[PDB]
């Protein structure tokens, strides 16, 4: 992997952040915020790589720190959403009170260099967002460069180009952050992964021969590819559960789930959980209360 | 419960966002962002209240949407952290280039009314942060009121009071968001809840009579009070596991865990999981792989 992306990205985030206030460009500020999200993503990726190749799986994190990638992805998406909210609010203000670019040359140089940085990053919608933001910065600087606006003269149409394009790229960036927010939240909400079709899976689980009932089916995803399926199963007392275990495990394997914990409970009250918490008062803090 | 806090809070968020931008006050802007986080928290609380007393727990969310409170808490904390990052960056910018307050009267009125809004919200460290943010806005407005500053006159010490206090309250707000970020991330990372002392719990689990081995102990917290403990247990084949099940469940009950799924596996190599995925290639996906 490449780690020089982190130092370059943080230095360039600082550069765009300084030049955006120095040049009075929201598009440069929006691109600086987008590269801030990019460097947060790089830090999250390095954290995931460090968690891998050196697992801990101790007494504090039972599953491990694999969920760090998803938590960091959701946090980065929410961070970028708040930054885009601030950028959109500022752009709406400048759509009412327009402002000039103080140093069009500085903004042009920083935007061109940011476009080059994003190009080399892609070389080594979500991905094209940074490139389009740098293109927007370059266009805004060029308009103030090819057709200069005198300081004494009031704001012409040129002052509205930056807020409009910045609003457009706020929309573009949000159109990528929102699906990411939805996916990472769905993973973190302990929801069934999109690949797993639960209806057919429960149909097959019920169709498994020699099994009385199936309850407390809890299928959730730790990370991409790690699907955990907790499951309680009621079986006739006289018969065993070795064949049932094999069939349920192969069904889950064919459904893409390899982490299957089956609790077998001996057998209209014969459908409830035979092994809840040892007290009747535990029914409050029991998922799927009986 | 009362939901008029939502409409009042959103209206006042709009009011402070407009007034701080019209009055050029970061402290008013910081308080508007803090009340935006407050209304996000109110929306999260309403979502949690709707999830309760009306559960769904269907084929999409096995554990339900109870984790929505934690996901919304982390999202709100990250949103507020990004807003505070923007506020701190702006304040540092004004710490270099000071600015006047355009309409001190408007900022004074909005800050006083925001303090009243916080007071009435109390009537019906985050609280100290919000109250002190309103007090900071009020103080900044008063300073520009008792000693009015003419536009012709350059910025005196008065122009640096707003950025300094705003930086201070960015620190204060972050000192509350960061513990919340840590706690909600720990919950969402599938980490052992703080109350559960895993060392003693595994000691007792091993000390349980009639049990050969214990592996795949996965203790995580869905929400406050809902602790889920998946667990694989190896037991001697000749002996049963009814007494072992009772003892393990009562141990988990005394440790504060009521959702316990125990998989009992019949018995050097007699310590590995007897029921991995049906294929040897599944070991790359085995969470906690042997």
From Swiss-Prot, chains A, B:
GO terms for cellular component: early endosome; early endosome membrane; Golgi apparatus; Golgi membrane; membrane; plasma membrane; recycling endosome; recycling endosome membrane. Residues 23-31, 94-104, 148-160 are extracellular. The keyword Transmembrane helix applies. The lineage of its organism: Eukaryota, Metazoa, Chordata, Craniata, Vertebrata. It is a multi-pass membrane protein. It comes from Homo sapiens (Human). The record marks 34 as: Important for coupling of manganese to calcium transport. This is Calcium/manganese antiporter SLC30A10. Changing residue 38 to E: Loss of calcium:manganese antiporter activity. Keywords: Antiport, Cell membrane, Disease variant, Dystonia, Endosome, Golgi apparatus, Ion transport, Manganese, Membrane, Neurodegeneration, Parkinsonism, Transmembrane, Transmembrane helix, Transport, Zinc, Zinc transport. Changing residue 16 to A: No effect on localization to the plasma membrane. Loss of calcium:manganese antiporter activity.
